């Protein structure tokens, strides 16, 4: 049995990202068993609330990729309005296609088959820098960021520390 | 000139197109007013499926020509 | 009271009102040969008031070329009398009858008249009366590889729905008093001239919000006019238009006056010049028949062809038809005049059957008016086609032999086919094969596989199945059914009940595929189609693919070393929604339905499985503490469902359900509002609850409210189903328990090592509850008595009431929640026809790609279109051409190192990356630490290691794919590799 278009595209994209890796994140497979399950380690962007932090995530690609977007889940504990408590990232570029219903959000702003995994990750970086309050996944985080951003600042920094102590786990 | 792109649903799209315009150009415009990517569009004219890299002229698509925007279906 | 259990999938195509009209419409069908019976079959399954057959002519053997309801024992019997009993069994809500004589006054009993196998002269008689009394008229005939359909619904036929599409809609920006409407920033209205639109929420002139539709006048892509509205308001804005589907007058010409100037429906713009030729030829067939006592020109008879050719000249002159007659093309009709192909009948019959429904429902746009069709590319060329070979014989395949010849029949007979799917398309396909005489020969065979069983819903478009066959396997019943249609297939068909996929490669393996002539799909999902495609690419076998959706359908053919494969292209994916939208911010009913489904699973399934796994698995607790997304919810599920919230009476389930109401439609909404007050504002000035967001409102329980009570019963009944408690319908009991319910006061809330999950200790041990299991609710749309759809609908609409969304009845909810695909017999018959018209091209072994044809159609609008398959991508390497799709490398089970060294100079390409399936075997960017480890391993060993699975014994090959760069820097995609073990 030959390979689908999905498998071929992931190879070429895995090769390209793991050729000239854009700084800020590292990309690899959870297991060579499957190229449809990437793990991603993200450095907390400079100057942002998360700087110094080290966040691990998982890009799960669907069988019919790139018709559908991948799902990104933070495994590292994180506190963000656009990140569900279970870890799932919720941003526009990862929303399924497309237009409809009443004519608010267009098809060109969500997922497109052309968006490389690199394009996604870059979008999730900027998400950490500047939260989008039009799509909150964590209600509690969405409030604290608005009504007392100095206790939100505090809680993030606590989770930034706990991420470093988990790097020490490699022992 | 002017062409027509009728969908399998019955919707008719009219387009002011140059005889020099590429099929890629046309596919891009149809995405911008229906919301399906080019690689999922299937355009047909006079019994042949339009391929990228060519132009309307390569298929002799003159004025009042009608293209059919079709798709494959999954039911059985 | 229309049987929703039966007509479900069809209702989602036609609608209830259309079907009411149908059940009040009588249909007369003239002629019960190949074409007639197909039309009748579909109309019967569709569900009209009654079907009347007229065909007193006795059954001849050559009729069996496509009349699948006629057997050889029925020879000499009037066809209509034989057919009626078979057709009656199709639909218990449709009576079928026969008439021995017709009269013009008798036609008044019918809403639509179908005419097959009738002369032009008698057609004119019939149509003159029906057109005069405004009775729908459809004439259709199948002649070899040529087909014709004529429709006439009267001079004053009204169409209430021209395409079945949902009413268009868009948000308004502004409306001048002069009447020029403008959409929001960069939004197309998609309207067209003549369309009618109403308005709502238009601020500036509330008069347009009346509902009065206005004629649209398109001015541009973003604007359109409706007329001067200077009467009220100087300027409007921030409104919403909505298309009003207006009844459309369709003025049909009679058959008499339209014979001179016929309006054409072109099924192929590539053959634009052909319909006029056929318009004369089909009349010449009638003129010829009158001049030979009803007999058509004999097969490939040159004499009759020339005589036929002269009739065309006379008719062309008399009608003052100024067209230059194509002699080659015209004589081909004579040569194939006595041709009766099942594929052609299945194609035309489906199309015609749809048209009958149009005439009776005023829904969908009819054919206006002449539909001339040919599949002439289907004609063989690898065999002799002459007067001798096409000579009739005493066998049933005469109607087919009359076109393809006797030696071509041998090729069809010796075919070894694989049919994937015994559903709607599967049934029609097996029927066609039976008629064609596929696999009837000694070396021929049919393998059909389908793991699904027959359901009541299926009987509406799967005609090989009957009401009593419900519960049985589709593959077995489909086989037994066609054995009756063609006993030659007795012992020639093997039925499997296997899901086609990786799991079943042991059964559908190397030996299975190698003896196949071709594969045919009849699938209902894309994943399976892709899989079969790739297997067919490996074994270099042809693949016939087809699919449907309501009145839409398509056909694709995959030819080895010629065309691209099914996987070479993709189609738009199924619509889905993100959790963030669903959990708190719904704005469609589809959002609340999806939410309601997760709620159904969350209450009556997911916690139940955790309980049952806790009691059945020995190390479940600490295993879930280690390897679960959310160990917390698992434990809280065990506790709540085994001891805390466990009911002891059904009245406690009512108490429970009353509590769930507050939890999901009240308290949670209060909590959401406390986090995002109704007057909240995001950091851009805009109010939070605006646009796609809709400010919700808590719900105060009210037993006298319809939807509130519907939820309690559904929820409580389902909760009882988990613990095996008996439900109660008597509303008196609910009133009692609910009256004595005091809602606990709820208020919106504002070194760890906080593992407070020592509550697993508060759980009784599995040893304390040996042999105790809870019953999880497995979502089943098609059972209307299990409270599943009831719950979804109630919960969905309660949440719809929260967020000010228009609720939906269980019918729409059942469609969405169930992910039901609209489908009816008509489109399924049509695709089955086109597929078989392509199959005969594969049998002929046609090497020209332009001979093949991919089909696409919509019966709702009489749209047919075809196209040449795309050729497989080529790539000349080192000299001659290689096929990127079909060609392969055949190598030994060597080592990874010497495999890379094989492409070193044998091809001149560095293997930058190597994979097997979804598994990455090697990549040049991988660390040298495991490169040196995995380089000296055999592929067979290397694969078994990475996949953590040992190669199965039946596996004799192994497929690898590689990315390759030429000595230059850039990549070059290359054919795949087949490793022999």
mmCIF file with all atom_site columns, C-alpha atoms in Angstrom, chain A:
data_model
loop_
_atom_site.group_PDB
_atom_site.id
_atom_site.type_symbol
_atom_site.label_atom_id
_atom_site.label_alt_id
_atom_site.label_comp_id
_atom_site.label_asym_id
_atom_site.label_entity_id
_atom_site.label_seq_id
_atom_site.pdbx_PDB_ins_code
_atom_site.Cartn_x
_atom_site.Cartn_y
_atom_site.Cartn_z
_atom_site.occupancy
_atom_site.B_iso_or_equiv
_atom_site.pdbx_formal_charge
_atom_site.auth_seq_id
_atom_site.auth_comp_id
_atom_site.auth_asym_id
_atom_site.auth_atom_id
_atom_site.pdbx_PDB_model_num
ATOM 1   C CA . UNK A 1 1   ? 0.000   0.000  0.000  1.00 0.00 ? 1   UNK A CA 1
ATOM 2   C CA . UNK A 1 2   ? 1.468   3.384  -1.035 1.00 0.00 ? 2   UNK A CA 1
ATOM 3   C CA . UNK A 1 3   ? 1.205   6.499  1.139  1.00 0.00 ? 3   UNK A CA 1
ATOM 4   C CA . UNK A 1 4   ? -1.629  9.033  1.136  1.00 0.00 ? 4   UNK A CA 1
ATOM 5   C CA . UNK A 1 5   ? -1.143  12.714 0.337  1.00 0.00 ? 5   UNK A CA 1
ATOM 6   C CA . UNK A 1 6   ? -1.362  13.415 4.069  1.00 0.00 ? 6   UNK A CA 1
ATOM 7   C CA . UNK A 1 7   ? 1.666   11.271 4.905  1.00 0.00 ? 7   UNK A CA 1
ATOM 8   C CA . UNK A 1 8   ? 3.767   12.739 2.092  1.00 0.00 ? 8   UNK A CA 1
ATOM 9   C CA . UNK A 1 9   ? 3.005   16.326 3.075  1.00 0.00 ? 9   UNK A CA 1
ATOM 10  C CA . UNK A 1 10  ? 3.898   15.755 6.731  1.00 0.00 ? 10  UNK A CA 1
ATOM 11  C CA . UNK A 1 11  ? 7.258   14.285 5.741  1.00 0.00 ? 11  UNK A CA 1
ATOM 12  C CA . UNK A 1 12  ? 8.235   17.257 3.578  1.00 0.00 ? 12  UNK A CA 1
ATOM 13  C CA . UNK A 1 13  ? 7.005   19.659 6.264  1.00 0.00 ? 13  UNK A CA 1
ATOM 14  C CA . UNK A 1 14  ? 8.805   17.722 9.009  1.00 0.00 ? 14  UNK A CA 1
ATOM 15  C CA . UNK A 1 15  ? 11.953  17.808 6.898  1.00 0.00 ? 15  UNK A CA 1
ATOM 16  C CA . UNK A 1 16  ? 11.745  21.551 6.229  1.00 0.00 ? 16  UNK A CA 1
ATOM 17  C CA . UNK A 1 17  ? 11.040  22.556 9.832  1.00 0.00 ? 17  UNK A CA 1
ATOM 18  C CA . UNK A 1 18  ? 13.768  20.178 11.007 1.00 0.00 ? 18  UNK A CA 1
ATOM 19  C CA . UNK A 1 19  ? 16.167  21.689 8.469  1.00 0.00 ? 19  UNK A CA 1
ATOM 20  C CA . UNK A 1 20  ? 16.206  25.413 9.244  1.00 0.00 ? 20  UNK A CA 1
ATOM 21  C CA . UNK A 1 21  ? 14.327  25.430 12.580 1.00 0.00 ? 21  UNK A CA 1
ATOM 22  C CA . UNK A 1 22  ? 12.839  28.869 13.374 1.00 0.00 ? 22  UNK A CA 1
ATOM 23  C CA . UNK A 1 23  ? 13.988  29.988 16.829 1.00 0.00 ? 23  UNK A CA 1
ATOM 24  C CA . UNK A 1 24  ? 11.523  29.925 19.722 1.00 0.00 ? 24  UNK A CA 1
ATOM 25  C CA . UNK A 1 25  ? 10.391  26.311 19.453 1.00 0.00 ? 25  UNK A CA 1
ATOM 26  C CA . UNK A 1 26  ? 11.713  22.812 18.792 1.00 0.00 ? 26  UNK A CA 1
ATOM 27  C CA . UNK A 1 27  ? 9.783   20.257 16.739 1.00 0.00 ? 27  UNK A CA 1
ATOM 28  C CA . UNK A 1 28  ? 10.043  16.478 16.783 1.00 0.00 ? 28  UNK A CA 1
ATOM 29  C CA . UNK A 1 29  ? 7.881   13.364 16.826 1.00 0.00 ? 29  UNK A CA 1
ATOM 30  C CA . UNK A 1 30  ? 6.415   11.962 20.041 1.00 0.00 ? 30  UNK A CA 1
ATOM 31  C CA . UNK A 1 31  ? 7.503   8.699  18.442 1.00 0.00 ? 31  UNK A CA 1
ATOM 32  C CA . UNK A 1 32  ? 8.863   7.749  15.012 1.00 0.00 ? 32  UNK A CA 1
ATOM 33  C CA . UNK A 1 33  ? 5.961   5.287  15.155 1.00 0.00 ? 33  UNK A CA 1
ATOM 34  C CA . UNK A 1 34  ? 3.858   8.124  13.716 1.00 0.00 ? 34  UNK A CA 1
ATOM 35  C CA . UNK A 1 35  ? 4.542   11.371 11.856 1.00 0.00 ? 35  UNK A CA 1
ATOM 36  C CA . UNK A 1 36  ? 0.989   12.463 12.698 1.00 0.00 ? 36  UNK A CA 1
ATOM 37  C CA . UNK A 1 37  ? 1.939   13.115 16.329 1.00 0.00 ? 37  UNK A CA 1
ATOM 38  C CA . UNK A 1 38  ? 4.433   15.932 16.810 1.00 0.00 ? 38  UNK A CA 1
ATOM 39  C CA . UNK A 1 39  ? 5.643   17.193 20.171 1.00 0.00 ? 39  UNK A CA 1
ATOM 40  C CA . UNK A 1 40  ? 6.585   20.860 20.467 1.00 0.00 ? 40  UNK A CA 1
ATOM 41  C CA . UNK A 1 41  ? 8.696   22.584 23.116 1.00 0.00 ? 41  UNK A CA 1
ATOM 42  C CA . UNK A 1 42  ? 8.169   26.353 23.153 1.00 0.00 ? 42  UNK A CA 1
ATOM 43  C CA . UNK A 1 43  ? 10.345  28.937 24.867 1.00 0.00 ? 43  UNK A CA 1
ATOM 44  C CA . UNK A 1 44  ? 8.245   31.563 26.611 1.00 0.00 ? 44  UNK A CA 1
ATOM 45  C CA . UNK A 1 45  ? 8.527   34.583 24.283 1.00 0.00 ? 45  UNK A CA 1
ATOM 46  C CA . UNK A 1 46  ? 10.895  37.376 25.333 1.00 0.00 ? 46  UNK A CA 1
ATOM 47  C CA . UNK A 1 47  ? 9.445   40.330 27.288 1.00 0.00 ? 47  UNK A CA 1
ATOM 48  C CA . UNK A 1 48  ? 6.018   38.646 27.503 1.00 0.00 ? 48  UNK A CA 1
ATOM 49  C CA . UNK A 1 49  ? 4.366   37.354 30.677 1.00 0.00 ? 49  UNK A CA 1
ATOM 50  C CA . UNK A 1 50  ? 5.744   33.901 29.903 1.00 0.00 ? 50  UNK A CA 1
ATOM 51  C CA . UNK A 1 51  ? 9.410   34.755 29.232 1.00 0.00 ? 51  UNK A CA 1
ATOM 52  C CA . UNK A 1 52  ? 11.939  32.351 30.726 1.00 0.00 ? 52  UNK A CA 1
ATOM 53  C CA . UNK A 1 53  ? 9.299   29.633 30.663 1.00 0.00 ? 53  UNK A CA 1
ATOM 54  C CA . UNK A 1 54  ? 9.514   26.313 28.847 1.00 0.00 ? 54  UNK A CA 1
ATOM 55  C CA . UNK A 1 55  ? 6.227   24.931 27.506 1.00 0.00 ? 55  UNK A CA 1
ATOM 56  C CA . UNK A 1 56  ? 5.676   21.501 25.978 1.00 0.00 ? 56  UNK A CA 1
ATOM 57  C CA . UNK A 1 57  ? 2.795   20.907 23.577 1.00 0.00 ? 57  UNK A CA 1
ATOM 58  C CA . UNK A 1 58  ? 1.477   18.309 21.140 1.00 0.00 ? 58  UNK A CA 1
ATOM 59  C CA . UNK A 1 59  ? 0.443   18.905 17.527 1.00 0.00 ? 59  UNK A CA 1
ATOM 60  C CA . UNK A 1 60  ? -1.992  16.137 16.632 1.00 0.00 ? 60  UNK A CA 1
ATOM 61  C CA . UNK A 1 61  ? -2.576  16.077 12.870 1.00 0.00 ? 61  UNK A CA 1
ATOM 62  C CA . UNK A 1 62  ? -5.854  14.648 11.512 1.00 0.00 ? 62  UNK A CA 1
ATOM 63  C CA . UNK A 1 63  ? -5.928  11.729 9.066  1.00 0.00 ? 63  UNK A CA 1
ATOM 64  C CA . UNK A 1 64  ? -7.320  14.050 6.370  1.00 0.00 ? 64  UNK A CA 1
ATOM 65  C CA . UNK A 1 65  ? -4.740  16.801 6.874  1.00 0.00 ? 65  UNK A CA 1
ATOM 66  C CA . UNK A 1 66  ? -4.413  19.416 5.405  1.00 0.00 ? 66  UNK A CA 1
ATOM 67  C CA . UNK A 1 67  ? -8.184  19.569 4.765  1.00 0.00 ? 67  UNK A CA 1
ATOM 68  C CA . UNK A 1 68  ? -8.490  19.911 8.543  1.00 0.00 ? 68  UNK A CA 1
ATOM 69  C CA . UNK A 1 69  ? -6.170  21.727 10.956 1.00 0.00 ? 69  UNK A CA 1
ATOM 70  C CA . UNK A 1 70  ? -4.022  20.050 13.616 1.00 0.00 ? 70  UNK A CA 1
ATOM 71  C CA . UNK A 1 71  ? -4.969  20.229 17.301 1.00 0.00 ? 71  UNK A CA 1
ATOM 72  C CA . UNK A 1 72  ? -2.460  21.775 19.676 1.00 0.00 ? 72  UNK A CA 1
ATOM 73  C CA . UNK A 1 73  ? -2.524  20.830 23.365 1.00 0.00 ? 73  UNK A CA 1
ATOM 74  C CA . UNK A 1 74  ? -0.240  22.275 26.016 1.00 0.00 ? 74  UNK A CA 1
ATOM 75  C CA . UNK A 1 75  ? 0.950   19.497 28.317 1.00 0.00 ? 75  UNK A CA 1
ATOM 76  C CA . UNK A 1 76  ? 2.789   22.022 30.470 1.00 0.00 ? 76  UNK A CA 1
ATOM 77  C CA . UNK A 1 77  ? 0.494   23.724 32.973 1.00 0.00 ? 77  UNK A CA 1
ATOM 78  C CA . UNK A 1 78  ? -0.363  27.155 31.593 1.00 0.00 ? 78  UNK A CA 1
ATOM 79  C CA . UNK A 1 79  ? -2.741  29.999 32.438 1.00 0.00 ? 79  UNK A CA 1
ATOM 80  C CA . UNK A 1 80  ? -4.078  31.773 29.354 1.00 0.00 ? 80  UNK A CA 1
ATOM 81  C CA . UNK A 1 81  ? -7.481  33.008 28.124 1.00 0.00 ? 81  UNK A CA 1
ATOM 82  C CA . UNK A 1 82  ? -7.126  31.252 24.753 1.00 0.00 ? 82  UNK A CA 1
ATOM 83  C CA . UNK A 1 83  ? -5.974  27.976 26.327 1.00 0.00 ? 83  UNK A CA 1
ATOM 84  C CA . UNK A 1 84  ? -8.561  25.609 27.769 1.00 0.00 ? 84  UNK A CA 1
ATOM 85  C CA . UNK A 1 85  ? -7.728  24.114 31.201 1.00 0.00 ? 85  UNK A CA 1
ATOM 86  C CA . UNK A 1 86  ? -7.302  20.706 29.520 1.00 0.00 ? 86  UNK A CA 1
ATOM 87  C CA . UNK A 1 87  ? -4.473  22.297 27.528 1.00 0.00 ? 87  UNK A CA 1
ATOM 88  C CA . UNK A 1 88  ? -6.148  22.764 24.150 1.00 0.00 ? 88  UNK A CA 1
ATOM 89  C CA . UNK A 1 89  ? -5.202  25.917 22.239 1.00 0.00 ? 89  UNK A CA 1
ATOM 90  C CA . UNK A 1 90  ? -8.085  27.912 20.730 1.00 0.00 ? 90  UNK A CA 1
ATOM 91  C CA . UNK A 1 91  ? -7.118  30.482 18.086 1.00 0.00 ? 91  UNK A CA 1
ATOM 92  C CA . UNK A 1 92  ? -8.533  31.511 14.705 1.00 0.00 ? 92  UNK A CA 1
ATOM 93  C CA . UNK A 1 93  ? -5.966  29.817 12.457 1.00 0.00 ? 93  UNK A CA 1
ATOM 94  C CA . UNK A 1 94  ? -6.785  26.462 14.080 1.00 0.00 ? 94  UNK A CA 1
ATOM 95  C CA . UNK A 1 95  ? -10.562 26.838 13.697 1.00 0.00 ? 95  UNK A CA 1
ATOM 96  C CA . UNK A 1 96  ? -12.035 24.482 11.091 1.00 0.00 ? 96  UNK A CA 1
ATOM 97  C CA . UNK A 1 97  ? -13.268 25.791 7.680  1.00 0.00 ? 97  UNK A CA 1
ATOM 98  C CA . UNK A 1 98  ? -14.873 28.097 6.878  1.00 0.00 ? 98  UNK A CA 1
ATOM 99  C CA . UNK A 1 99  ? -17.478 30.777 6.136  1.00 0.00 ? 99  UNK A CA 1
ATOM 100 C CA . UNK A 1 100 ? -21.008 30.886 7.563  1.00 0.00 ? 100 UNK A CA 1
ATOM 101 C CA . UNK A 1 101 ? -23.408 31.415 9.076  1.00 0.00 ? 101 UNK A CA 1
ATOM 102 C CA . UNK A 1 102 ? -24.462 35.032 9.461  1.00 0.00 ? 102 UNK A CA 1
ATOM 103 C CA . UNK A 1 103 ? -21.322 36.447 7.844  1.00 0.00 ? 103 UNK A CA 1
ATOM 104 C CA . UNK A 1 104 ? -19.105 37.451 10.759 1.00 0.00 ? 104 UNK A CA 1
ATOM 105 C CA . UNK A 1 105 ? -15.909 35.416 10.314 1.00 0.00 ? 105 UNK A CA 1
ATOM 106 C CA . UNK A 1 106 ? -14.605 34.772 6.796  1.00 0.00 ? 106 UNK A CA 1
ATOM 107 C CA . UNK A 1 107 ? -13.038 31.551 5.495  1.00 0.00 ? 107 UNK A CA 1
ATOM 108 C CA . UNK A 1 108 ? -9.658  33.142 4.792  1.00 0.00 ? 108 UNK A CA 1
ATOM 109 C CA . UNK A 1 109 ? -8.909  33.937 8.435  1.00 0.00 ? 109 UNK A CA 1
ATOM 110 C CA . UNK A 1 110 ? -9.384  30.404 9.775  1.00 0.00 ? 110 UNK A CA 1
ATOM 111 C CA . UNK A 1 111 ? -7.647  27.207 8.625  1.00 0.00 ? 111 UNK A CA 1
ATOM 112 C CA . UNK A 1 112 ? -6.379  26.893 5.065  1.00 0.00 ? 112 UNK A CA 1
ATOM 113 C CA . UNK A 1 113 ? -4.681  23.825 3.531  1.00 0.00 ? 113 UNK A CA 1
ATOM 114 C CA . UNK A 1 114 ? -1.633  25.992 2.768  1.00 0.00 ? 114 UNK A CA 1
ATOM 115 C CA . UNK A 1 115 ? -0.771  26.956 6.358  1.00 0.00 ? 115 UNK A CA 1
ATOM 116 C CA . UNK A 1 116 ? 2.404   25.112 7.341  1.00 0.00 ? 116 UNK A CA 1
ATOM 117 C CA . UNK A 1 117 ? 2.904   23.871 10.923 1.00 0.00 ? 117 UNK A CA 1
ATOM 118 C CA . UNK A 1 118 ? 5.440   26.693 11.201 1.00 0.00 ? 118 UNK A CA 1
ATOM 119 C CA . UNK A 1 119 ? 2.751   29.266 10.392 1.00 0.00 ? 119 UNK A CA 1
ATOM 120 C CA . UNK A 1 120 ? 0.582   27.787 13.140 1.00 0.00 ? 120 UNK A CA 1
ATOM 121 C CA . UNK A 1 121 ? 3.284   27.811 15.798 1.00 0.00 ? 121 UNK A CA 1
ATOM 122 C CA . UNK A 1 122 ? 4.202   31.409 14.999 1.00 0.00 ? 122 UNK A CA 1
ATOM 123 C CA . UNK A 1 123 ? 0.529   32.273 15.498 1.00 0.00 ? 123 UNK A CA 1
ATOM 124 C CA . UNK A 1 124 ? 0.511   30.548 18.895 1.00 0.00 ? 124 UNK A CA 1
ATOM 125 C CA . UNK A 1 125 ? 3.618   32.492 19.919 1.00 0.00 ? 125 UNK A CA 1
ATOM 126 C CA . UNK A 1 126 ? 1.956   35.855 19.266 1.00 0.00 ? 126 UNK A CA 1
ATOM 127 C CA . UNK A 1 127 ? -1.061  34.471 21.127 1.00 0.00 ? 127 UNK A CA 1
ATOM 128 C CA . UNK A 1 128 ? 1.093   34.216 24.256 1.00 0.00 ? 128 UNK A CA 1
ATOM 129 C CA . UNK A 1 129 ? 2.235   37.804 23.750 1.00 0.00 ? 129 UNK A CA 1
ATOM 130 C CA . UNK A 1 130 ? -1.215  39.359 23.262 1.00 0.00 ? 130 UNK A CA 1
ATOM 131 C CA . UNK A 1 131 ? -4.348  37.387 24.343 1.00 0.00 ? 131 UNK A CA 1
ATOM 132 C CA . UNK A 1 132 ? -7.427  37.516 22.093 1.00 0.00 ? 132 UNK A CA 1
ATOM 133 C CA . UNK A 1 133 ? -10.535 38.277 24.157 1.00 0.00 ? 133 UNK A CA 1
ATOM 134 C CA . UNK A 1 134 ? -12.985 37.359 21.372 1.00 0.00 ? 134 UNK A CA 1
ATOM 135 C CA . UNK A 1 135 ? -12.367 33.626 21.800 1.00 0.00 ? 135 UNK A CA 1
ATOM 136 C CA . UNK A 1 136 ? -11.777 32.786 25.448 1.00 0.00 ? 136 UNK A CA 1
ATOM 137 C CA . UNK A 1 137 ? -11.347 29.097 26.285 1.00 0.00 ? 137 UNK A CA 1
ATOM 138 C CA . UNK A 1 138 ? -10.580 29.669 29.966 1.00 0.00 ? 138 UNK A CA 1
ATOM 139 C CA . UNK A 1 139 ? -13.315 31.819 31.509 1.00 0.00 ? 139 UNK A CA 1
ATOM 140 C CA . UNK A 1 140 ? -11.524 32.175 34.845 1.00 0.00 ? 140 UNK A CA 1
ATOM 141 C CA . UNK A 1 141 ? -8.287  33.222 33.147 1.00 0.00 ? 141 UNK A CA 1
ATOM 142 C CA . UNK A 1 142 ? -10.184 35.595 30.868 1.00 0.00 ? 142 UNK A CA 1
ATOM 143 C CA . UNK A 1 143 ? -11.575 37.460 33.877 1.00 0.00 ? 143 UNK A CA 1
ATOM 144 C CA . UNK A 1 144 ? -8.429  37.633 35.985 1.00 0.00 ? 144 UNK A CA 1
ATOM 145 C CA . UNK A 1 145 ? -6.578  39.066 32.985 1.00 0.00 ? 145 UNK A CA 1
ATOM 146 C CA . UNK A 1 146 ? -9.191  41.840 32.845 1.00 0.00 ? 146 UNK A CA 1
ATOM 147 C CA . UNK A 1 147 ? -10.204 42.679 36.416 1.00 0.00 ? 147 UNK A CA 1
ATOM 148 C CA . UNK A 1 148 ? -6.894  42.086 38.218 1.00 0.00 ? 148 UNK A CA 1
ATOM 149 C CA . UNK A 1 149 ? -4.023  41.634 35.725 1.00 0.00 ? 149 UNK A CA 1
ATOM 150 C CA . UNK A 1 150 ? -1.488  41.795 38.581 1.00 0.00 ? 150 UNK A CA 1
ATOM 151 C CA . UNK A 1 151 ? -2.735  38.560 40.136 1.00 0.00 ? 151 UNK A CA 1
ATOM 152 C CA . UNK A 1 152 ? -2.907  37.043 36.665 1.00 0.00 ? 152 UNK A CA 1
ATOM 153 C CA . UNK A 1 153 ? 0.690   38.196 36.187 1.00 0.00 ? 153 UNK A CA 1
ATOM 154 C CA . UNK A 1 154 ? 1.506   36.489 39.479 1.00 0.00 ? 154 UNK A CA 1
ATOM 155 C CA . UNK A 1 155 ? -0.102  33.159 38.601 1.00 0.00 ? 155 UNK A CA 1
ATOM 156 C CA . UNK A 1 156 ? 1.576   32.968 35.196 1.00 0.00 ? 156 UNK A CA 1
ATOM 157 C CA . UNK A 1 157 ? 4.991   33.633 36.717 1.00 0.00 ? 157 UNK A CA 1
ATOM 158 C CA . UNK A 1 158 ? 4.340   30.825 39.212 1.00 0.00 ? 158 UNK A CA 1
ATOM 159 C CA . UNK A 1 159 ? 3.624   28.425 36.348 1.00 0.00 ? 159 UNK A CA 1
ATOM 160 C CA . UNK A 1 160 ? 6.724   29.675 34.531 1.00 0.00 ? 160 UNK A CA 1
ATOM 161 C CA . UNK A 1 161 ? 8.780   28.530 37.522 1.00 0.00 ? 161 UNK A CA 1
ATOM 162 C CA . UNK A 1 162 ? 7.062   25.153 37.802 1.00 0.00 ? 162 UNK A CA 1
ATOM 163 C CA . UNK A 1 163 ? 7.968   24.476 34.163 1.00 0.00 ? 163 UNK A CA 1
ATOM 164 C CA . UNK A 1 164 ? 11.686  24.837 34.900 1.00 0.00 ? 164 UNK A CA 1
ATOM 165 C CA . UNK A 1 165 ? 11.487  22.457 37.853 1.00 0.00 ? 165 UNK A CA 1
ATOM 166 C CA . UNK A 1 166 ? 10.034  19.886 35.440 1.00 0.00 ? 166 UNK A CA 1
ATOM 167 C CA . UNK A 1 167 ? 13.043  20.155 33.133 1.00 0.00 ? 167 UNK A CA 1
ATOM 168 C CA . UNK A 1 168 ? 15.019  18.825 36.101 1.00 0.00 ? 168 UNK A CA 1
ATOM 169 C CA . UNK A 1 169 ? 12.858  15.692 35.806 1.00 0.00 ? 169 UNK A CA 1
ATOM 170 C CA . UNK A 1 170 ? 15.381  14.362 33.293 1.00 0.00 ? 170 UNK A CA 1
ATOM 171 C CA . UNK A 1 171 ? 17.308  12.587 36.058 1.00 0.00 ? 171 UNK A CA 1
#
